[PDB]
Design a protein around this ligand. Structure first.
Ligand code: DMA
Ligand code: DMA
Ligand code: DMA
Ligand code: DMA
Ligand SMILES: [Mg+2]
Ligand SMILES: [Mg+2]
Lengths: 201, 205
């Protein structure tokens, strides 16, 4: 770990590129999501080691649930597994999203109140059946995502330079770092590169 | 140059005027007058290539807290930019907090979209703008349809000069899906190739 002079208080993660990653390996589009679980756990372990206090993962949007059933079932399954795996570590977990929907996984309702697992060394938020319009209209201190603070640094995998409607209130001033590799090809150097960028701003 | 796909609506963040001035050995406030011609050049290129709508980030409410000599210069440059475009076929709209002593009175004529000449392109300017003012301006549908910037549509491509990779609270509703292109050069060092590069990037998305 570099001797950072500064870290972001709050990083947002956009774990994009799972379908492209799968197709490149000769898999079906829906098979990439299960390969995005261990990267999230590796990113959690780095954040705990270096002292990042809060991480928000973009799980899936309301628009994502319009995708074919086989893809929706796979990404929902992978999101559930991610939250459950992180609950075995020292994470204070919160899931934010539209629970008044058939598309919100019932397995994740338990985590819609921030829950401390183990030593609670990092706060981890997950956006699940999330939509920016749902978030803003829920209401500014009363937006649906009000428990999620301002983001310092947003890191997106899969090479697209856009927010895909992640938390428009919290991302107003965020520095944005884009990794061209797809999310399942996560490496520590992607996070370290983004943190060097952040402290150099 | 010829493009396969063009964005309907480009947003511009003309950042880096003070760094540009200090690099040229000038006083911090002297960069802003050198940001006007870059704006007119971009408009000219947009009219030529056929971009329908351009929104310029002029200045925020937070920017008004800068030293007076900087504020008078950047306000003056925004007014000059709007007046000049008024002479060249732009449909102009200025969005910002008019209920403030920091809203330039010379731009009150533009707070309802106005066609000049042939109205070849829709040009919007954010002046004395803040994201919080915008969203809170606002049933919950009638609210988001009634944000202060509601007459500014969704942005396809946002181009920012000065090398910072952030939105600085530009139009959070309209930038949710925008593709973002960052030019490392400061805004007064604008060249056509900066816009061409951003449009090659956009058509490849
Ligand atoms: C749930 C979700 C949207 C995951 C991000 O990857 P993706 O399914 O968008 O993959 P790709 O960007 O390759 O289509
Ligand atoms: C994990 C996640 C939600 C990524 C972005 O969603 P997307 O791939 O649907 O967005 P876009 O089409 O804007 O790239
Ligand atoms: C009105 C305004 C905020 C202009 C953008 O350039 P700047 O004055 O922020 O310059 P710099 O980024 O070099 O300080
Ligand atoms: C032209 C313009 C309003 C740019 C952003 O202003 P900034 O320099 O105030 O923003 P930041 O501090 O986010 O770089
Ligand atoms: Mg995607
Ligand atoms: Mg600046």
């Amino acid at each position: 770990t570099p001797k950072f002079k500064r870290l972001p208080g709050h990083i947002a993660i956009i774990p994009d590129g799972n379908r492209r990653w799968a197709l490149d390996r000769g898999l079906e589009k829906h098979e990439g999501y299960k390969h995005g679980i261990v990267p999230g756990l590796e990113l959690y372990d780095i954040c705990v080691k270096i002292g990042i206090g809060e991480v928000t993962f973009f799980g899936f949007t309301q628009d994502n649930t319009k995708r074919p059933q086989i893809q929706r079932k796979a990404f929902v399954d992978a999101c559930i597994k991610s939250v459950k795996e992180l609950s075995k570590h020292d994470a204070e977990l919160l899931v934010v999203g539209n629970t008044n929907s058939d598309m919100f996984p019932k397995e994740l309702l338990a985590y819609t109140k921030r829950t401390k697992f183990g030593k609670g060394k990092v706060r981890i938020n997950f956006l699940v059946n999330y939509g920016w319009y749902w978030d803003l209209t829920y209401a500014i201190e009363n937006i649906a995502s009000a428990e999620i603070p301002r983001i310092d640094l947003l890191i997106r995998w899969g090479g697209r330079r856009r927010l895909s409607g992640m938390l428009p209130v919290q991302t107003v001033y965020s520095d944005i770092y884009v990794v061209d590799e797809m999310w399942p090809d996560f490496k520590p150097e992607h996070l370290f590169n983004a943190l060097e960028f952040y402290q150099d701003q």
